[PDB]
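Appendix B. Extra example for self-study. Work through it before the problem class; the solution is given directly after the inputs so you can check yourself.
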Amino acid sequence: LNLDPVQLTFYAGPNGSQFGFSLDFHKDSHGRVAIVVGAPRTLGPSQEETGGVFLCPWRAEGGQCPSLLFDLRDETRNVGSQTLQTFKARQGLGASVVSWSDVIVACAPWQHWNVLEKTEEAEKTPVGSCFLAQPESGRRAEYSPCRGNTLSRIYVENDFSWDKRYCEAGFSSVVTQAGELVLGAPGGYYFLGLLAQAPVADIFSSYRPGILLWHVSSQSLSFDSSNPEYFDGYWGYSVAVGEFDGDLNTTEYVVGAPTWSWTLGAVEILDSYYQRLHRLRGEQMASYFGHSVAVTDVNGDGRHDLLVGAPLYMESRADRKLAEVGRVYLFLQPRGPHALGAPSLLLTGTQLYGRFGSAIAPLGDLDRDGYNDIAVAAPYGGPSGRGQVLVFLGQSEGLRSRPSQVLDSPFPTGSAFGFSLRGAVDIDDNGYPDLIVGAYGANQVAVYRAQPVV
Amino acid sequence: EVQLQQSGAELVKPGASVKLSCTASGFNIKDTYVHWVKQRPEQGLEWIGRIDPANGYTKYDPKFQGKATITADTSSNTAYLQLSSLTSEDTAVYYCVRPLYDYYAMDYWGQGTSVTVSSAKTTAPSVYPLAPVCTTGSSVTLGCLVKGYFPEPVTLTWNSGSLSSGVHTFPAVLQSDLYTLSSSVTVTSSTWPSQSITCNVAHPASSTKVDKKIEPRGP
Amino acid sequence: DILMTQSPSSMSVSLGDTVSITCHASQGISSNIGWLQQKPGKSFMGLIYYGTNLVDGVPSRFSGSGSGADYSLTISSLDSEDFADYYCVQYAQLPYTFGGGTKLEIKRADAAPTVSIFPPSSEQLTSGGASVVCFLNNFYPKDINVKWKIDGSERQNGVLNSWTDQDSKDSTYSMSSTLTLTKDEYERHNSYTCEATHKTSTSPIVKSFNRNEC
Amino acid sequence: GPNICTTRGVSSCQQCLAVSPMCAWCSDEALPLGSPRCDLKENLLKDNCAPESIEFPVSEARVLEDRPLSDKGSGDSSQVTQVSPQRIALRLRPDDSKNFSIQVRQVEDYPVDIYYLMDLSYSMKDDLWSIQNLGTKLATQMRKLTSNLRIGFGAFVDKPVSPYMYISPPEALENPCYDMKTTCLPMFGYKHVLTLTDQVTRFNEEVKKQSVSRNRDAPEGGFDAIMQATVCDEKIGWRNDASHLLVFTTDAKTHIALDGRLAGIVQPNDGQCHVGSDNHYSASTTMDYPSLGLMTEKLSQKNINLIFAVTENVVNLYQNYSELIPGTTVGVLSMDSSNVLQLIVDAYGKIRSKVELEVRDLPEELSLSFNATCLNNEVIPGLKSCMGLKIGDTVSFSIEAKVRGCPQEKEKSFTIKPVGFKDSLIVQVTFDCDCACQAQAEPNSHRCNNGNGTFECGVCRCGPGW
Ligand SMILES: *[C@@H]1O[C@H](CO)[C@@H](O[C@@H]2O[C@H](CO)[C@@H](O[C@@H]3O[C@H](CO)[C@@H](O)[C@H](O[C@H]4O[C@H](CO)[C@@H](O)[C@H](O)[C@@H]4O)[C@@H]3O)[C@H](O)[C@H]2NC(C)=O)[C@H](O)[C@H]1NC(C)=O
Ligand SMILES: *[C@@H]1O[C@H](CO)[C@@H](O[C@@H]2O[C@H](CO)[C@@H](O)[C@H](O)[C@H]2NC(C)=O)[C@H](O)[C@H]1NC(C)=O
Ligand SMILES: CCc1nn2c(=O)cc(N3CCNCC3)nc2s1
Ligand SMILES: *[C@@H]1O[C@H](CO)[C@@H](O)[C@H](O)[C@H]1NC(C)=O
Ligand SMILES: [Ca+2]
Ligand SMILES: [Ca+2]
Ligand SMILES: [Ca+2]
Ligand SMILES: [Ca+2]
Ligand SMILES: [Ca+2]
Ligand SMILES: [Ca+2]
Ligand SMILES: [Mg+2]
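Solution. Structure tokens for the complete assembly:
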């Protein structure tokens, strides 16, 4: 309703860097809000693309941002009669970023790895890696849970069980309130997908540079399966956290698996031991149900609700024709231990190929009426096809079915405006929570400031 | 708190086999590689091999191929070292080891399991007094020889541990399948023999506790 | 296999010193070295991994350095707990191999040994044996040499030596030497002598006795 | 007595016609003191209204082009007629309806293009062997149905990019099968091999030189290939006047839009041809797999009939995709493709067993209703499609157009076309809501309130603007 679409703030990265692919708000130890931005095609030292991360201080006028520097050099370690190898070319550093406390986590999901032993090897594969930074202190750490030192032959001989070589750890990421990093790794276990969790404190305290393979003992990874419903499911394509079992001393995980069960798609709600509490199935195959997931209480009863995006959902139209427009599904959490039911509300896109539901961002309470609100991206939506973000306000029965406000991309065609979104943080300290929108195709981020309702 | 808890001292014959255990406390044994290491006083430290208990795959120094077999049971959170066709050279202290952080490192150690390979039947010690001979000095020294016992240990004291200071009980040494040990005690010339001094040697293995009073040689 | 040559095999030092233990590998091991500590009669504790990284719990007076084939463990300001055995281990290649170790011992003033000699007991003789014992007590430094003589001529067979660890509250060392013979062989000779050679004297400390006579 | 025409009390000839299609208007100068000008034509003539003064348009449907249906579709040059009539002229007065007819024929001996698009991952090695005489055998069986068969071939594996592609050791790039005891081709996304031709031994000989490659993950890159084989018209060589059959053979799941992000590919498929002179798809490593809706759009625009010829283990899957891509047909492929000939011949029959009318550019104001007379020779009402047809069969549809009110534009036109057919019925609509005497109206008439008004069709009208 009350985001200001007249006076925006723009931040810009280098041409071709894909600045804005991922973003998040970052509070320093003093509570000053900045914006961390991922730019996964930023050029590294060898003029190869490796990705980069930027830490943008808040300024109404916007502009350019300083880099948050991470080590971009390939590494080699000869140890235990093996040669360990990291490969950072085209790794996509900044394909995800998330901030928690005064720490920033930025991931390179396509970072490759190999282990050589005489004439054999593990195979050069995208295990992914995450980089952690405490900007104020300069501390750095890394987390790469899928790295191994098993040779190719052993997986073949063991029928490719526990195969974490193609994890792409960090493809999605989220941090629990208590400071546990949870990474989505959609290539895990031969493309089933997995989640890897470890406390941030333990990641820092257990990392040392140059070791490359090291134990984070407090970590927990999800499990492999022989159920072909899970095969090529990309479980971990998206991830979120919330409270869904009623016990406030446990955090639950929400995991998107957009190609689950032969491309039907699913989202699952799990406890922290990776035991499934609920499963929501997609409605239409190939719709990519689970592409995006969001958790927020939209109806003011104190119980978290779930929003799921299916950006390629084809709506039924006249004369038995289908139109790809995208769809968002709201599931309100009921009282007690019961199942999440049928969706409470279906929101559906209007512009063909708009990909409505590609990103869904909790906004907090934008209009300050007591109910939390959301923003849904259609990165190729709008009448012009340039991209749109739609705001939906919460209310006692869920969300309103018609948007309160629509933000048309200020960038040219192809910008992917809305592909990344973050809200619920007041960046200018005016008492209303604001929205940041990435447009990686234009290498820019737009900040929308919330203002008093008119 | 990480702690590797090993089995007690083993005491076996030549040609026999033995299986030492190493049990993980405060962590899951599948978490890291587990290594076994042999220590002797003379030859020093030797890496036997390692296992990944998660999958059971092992590596060995080719010197120990045939002799040592490392296994693991994730169920009982325990790793094992079996040694076969035992000989004198296998008498040593055996340790299980795991890394802290580095996959390949050697940071946490169990307390060690001592193995002794001998044909010696349990034999009680002969305990002999050692009074001086030839003389009129101010400081004096006596002794106690414990000869031909098996197995270790022997607790040696004087006057039931009353006289404790000025004492030197030397490490036992092996002499053709049996142990010998000695102790010296030093006192002022007026004390002995006017105040009685006695050597108390306990050998729990043979359930013996001989009491030898140190007497002079024809006073 | 990679040979780890650790130096020095021992050093006599004092509280508060900075000392260094070096380790040389037969080839480059790119910092894949650990340092270990074994206190007297105790198990092992890890000090350093990957060349320079303190194991959790280890004080910062310990530090590791080096590169290629040459590495050092330095201990600034020696504590009383630091008198112990130290070893290097390489894990660049299987099999893992260890240094021969270094013992840190307590520095102190030179002290000559108290030498005492003891003939066989009556008890032992009646059972058929004859053991001549010689104690060399409370000396420093640790390097000592004992020689047995029978009627003035050296005897080497049938001798059994034992050495104590450095004593906790005077830092001296002590030794026991035992010459065992058969009764009948002991009765073939008259003179029995224990000769202790030590850096405190140019000539040896000699203790003898004649069988029967006193 | 007073009917609806008269009781409405209309002010003009235009308003008179808008009351009902049975109303007429009399322009006669000499009409009695106060008789009603809007009435039934029967009532106007009896009241001495002149024959030339009657305005009474009748709705009608006259044919402009109705060439007869062709008996043969080959039929060279291809002036074949499958829809009769081809053009008619509708005239409609306000709120009126008129009916007309259309015949549609599934013509015998029509040209066919069959482009064979084959999964050439390693599990299809044995299939490559089975089909090496397919071109010859297919020609023999299709000869019964058509005298103008062209066939061609293309092949796909997946995006040649990690993690789909093995990228170590260097030997694996040149020969993905190096750690097995064979050699296969370097991985490829989609390659066109043989442009559609009547020279069927070209197919046999091309297929005999093809070999498989090898990649890591089960879903394959066939949807990329369907897109390119569809939008690269000139390279694939689809003919304007032929049935287009695109035979997709695979034994595995498929990659879909948004899967590409696992290879770092986020750029959406642009639905354009990217197969150049080297005959490989050059955007394979830089553009995402296509969505079902984009495939549907392109398949429909190029009139391509997609056939999923897939193994039993993925039949349910592709049948379910088929439901989301209307007009797609599914057949069960054996594990070595030994039954693919009959699968293609049955698919062709199923493809040409339906006539489904589609309406394009229908004006807002117009409504249509359809009654169908299919193979049985009897009427099924409210229906605009026939099924279970044989090649050679003719069906017909009765159509009624109803106009609501009268629109601003008096001339519009729309099209009725069977799905997938070349030929169509163009309907030219004229809206007859005006009176001829309006063209001979008289503004500023001395006869109308002393010059203030306009004299049209016998009455005075208040001028512009009063
Ligand atoms: C291709 O599409 C077909 C048709 O949609 C699809 O088959 C369907 O599969 C679904 C899911 O496997 C089946 O759904 C079941 O319906 C029966 C009613 O007869 C119920 O008993 C089932 O309920 C149980 O299981 C549910 C979870 O799936 C639970 O929610 C529930 O509590 C029960 O435990 C269930 O709803 C359905 O039977 C078929 N439909 C048909 C017509 O066959 C098929 O899977 C698709 N295949 C591929 C490869 O895409
Ligand atoms: C389609 O057929 C139906 C009959 O099933 C026709 O509908 C009826 O037509 C008769 C003609 O005398 C009328 O009596 C009925 O009132 C009609 N019912 C309706 C219109 O609902 C219809 O005429 C046929 N339509 C076409 C386009 O030919
Ligand atoms: C070499 C060709 C293989 N394909 N392939 C798959 O598609 C899935 C899978 N899984 C599924 C999850 N549990 C592990 C094995 N393993 C393999 S091995
Ligand atoms: C309209 O339908 C009638 C029968 O209801 C038929 O006789 C007439 O020919 C049809 N008109 C046209 C143009 O086909
Ligand atoms: Ca909970
Ligand atoms: Ca709620
Ligand atoms: Ca609100
Ligand atoms: Ca604000
Ligand atoms: Ca096959
Ligand atoms: Ca594939
Ligand atoms: Mg395949």
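Self-check: Chain B has two domains: 1-119, 120-214. If your reasoning did not lead you there, revisit section 3.
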